[PDB]
Amino acid sequence: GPLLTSAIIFYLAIGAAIFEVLEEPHWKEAKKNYYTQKLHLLKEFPCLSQEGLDKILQVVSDAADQGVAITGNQTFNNWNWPNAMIFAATVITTIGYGNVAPKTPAGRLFCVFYGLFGVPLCLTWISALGKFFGGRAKRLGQFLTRRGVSLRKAQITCTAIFIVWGVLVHLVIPPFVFMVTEEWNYIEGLYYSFITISTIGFGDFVAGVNPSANYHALYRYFVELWIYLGLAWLSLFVNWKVSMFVEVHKAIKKRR
Amino acid sequence: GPLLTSAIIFYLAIGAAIFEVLEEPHWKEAKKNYYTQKLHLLKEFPCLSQEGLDKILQVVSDAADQGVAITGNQTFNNWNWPNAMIFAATVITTIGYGNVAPKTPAGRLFCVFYGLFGVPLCLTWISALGKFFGGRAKRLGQFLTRRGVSLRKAQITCTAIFIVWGVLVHLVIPPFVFMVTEEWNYIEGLYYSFITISTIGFGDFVAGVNPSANYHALYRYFVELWIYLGLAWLSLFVNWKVSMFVEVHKAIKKRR
Numbered sequence A, B: 001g002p003l004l005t006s007a008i009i010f011y012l013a014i015g016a017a018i019f020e021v022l023e024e025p026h027w028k029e030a031k032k033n034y035y036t037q038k039l040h041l042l043k044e045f046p047c048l049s050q051e052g053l054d055k056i057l058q059v060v061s062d063a064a065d066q067g068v069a070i071t072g073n074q075t076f077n078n079w080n081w082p083n084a085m086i087f088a089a090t091v092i093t094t095i096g097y098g099n100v101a102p103k104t105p106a107g108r109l110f111c112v113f114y115g116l117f118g119v120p121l122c123l124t125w126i127s128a129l130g131k132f133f134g135g136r137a138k139r140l141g142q143f144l145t146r147r148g149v150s151l152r153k154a155q156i157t158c159t160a161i162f163i164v165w166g167v168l169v170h171l172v173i174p175p176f177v178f179m180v181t182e183e184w185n186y187i188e189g190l191y192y193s194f195i196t197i198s199t200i201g202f203g204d205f206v207a208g209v210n211p212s213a214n215y216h217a218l219y220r221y222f223v224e225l226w227i228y229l230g231l232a233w234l235s236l237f238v239n240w241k242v243s244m245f246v247e248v249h250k251a252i253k254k255r256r
């Protein structure tokens, strides 16, 4: 499509405008609140002049630069054996959340090598896993529909059931799980589920990382298994690009 | 098959071990240094009590959640027109830097659907322009090599030249450009280059977002264009998956 790039440009433009009108006033009022609360904090202690608060902000911005927390009790220990097991998984999945990242040059270069040698490995593993699940699921579905009441287009209904299963278990139900275990309303839950599935990983919402919470010994592992199952399920429709694309576009000639 | 998953488990285990032994010591030193700097800020300021520092830290962490900068002069305006355009560009690329993200429930709910409708669109567009570039490069290389001496391996030489060209232009050379314009030592530039090429996007390093730096008027657009071309070259190799995979491993059967 020679007009596909024009579509891209128009889409980028309108999305930028909507994001502007939606978020910019919030950012302005947030900055204004930050400024007035800084001023109020200065009024709380005139003995601490503006420069003292500047130095405080500098120490804070450098602590946040070295990974440690800001609020207090920065004893989460993101870099121990059970947790680095999880950070390694979000690297080889191209999620790259952003709440934790290497800070040492040796560590940075090792992370480069680890990604370079693992991302292809992890992607092939996930592709094979998803292909195996898809094959076995189609086999069992066909065996049930043929031994039972046979259908003319059972394959269409089968893939419909499969896609609704995926969308239900990965974008609708997890918001309710995280509502009770992570204290997120449905909007944040859906937002985090989608950010994770697409391997976008903004990292502003990460499950199983909250110092003021109680988690089971194998909770983060359950979350990681959920993430990997999501990526595996997605791999099928990633591979069905042209097949499903023409399958759905064959009827578009009637609609347009 | 089932042995591959064992490879994955051992890979994750050793990666977690090395990542621990690398960052965990420096993370502990960072935490202790933050603690000691806190104690120094406390002792140097008598009127600033422990609870006062707690309140300041909480207010900073609260504003830092909204996206504002902690340092000062947060006049970057990540949500003006061009910055929103570039953010939209990163979102639909599965990069998700995660240094900026929508903080409004309406904004998050809109970003979910924006991703849903753009990520497949942008992936298709990148794949199309990549196949275009690859076909043009292939026909040009063949027209050049058929004039002079040719061979069956000639196409293999063309593939090798294209591989090394991509490696140089997107992985090895950019660190020098960013040493010039961003003042990153080579390891930082290489780390950032790889992270953005593999669509990990940790967001610790982003090219073109610095309040104190003085960038050109088209700097960010050029960076984004280079990113798009890099991901196009990446997709070209992605679609070259199994052509080289099964061709070479069978050649070693005759070697023994």
Ligand SMILES: [K+]
Binding pocket: A093, A094, A095, A198, A199, A200, B093, B094, B095, B198, B199, B200
């Ligand atoms: K990604």
Ligand SMILES: [K+]
Binding pocket: A094, A095, A096, A097, A098, A199, A200, A201, A202, B094, B095, B096, B097, B098, B199, B200, B201, B202
């Ligand atoms: K990311």
Ligand SMILES: [K+]
Binding pocket: A094, A095, A096, A199, A200, A201, B094, B095, B096, B199, B200, B201
């Ligand atoms: K990502």
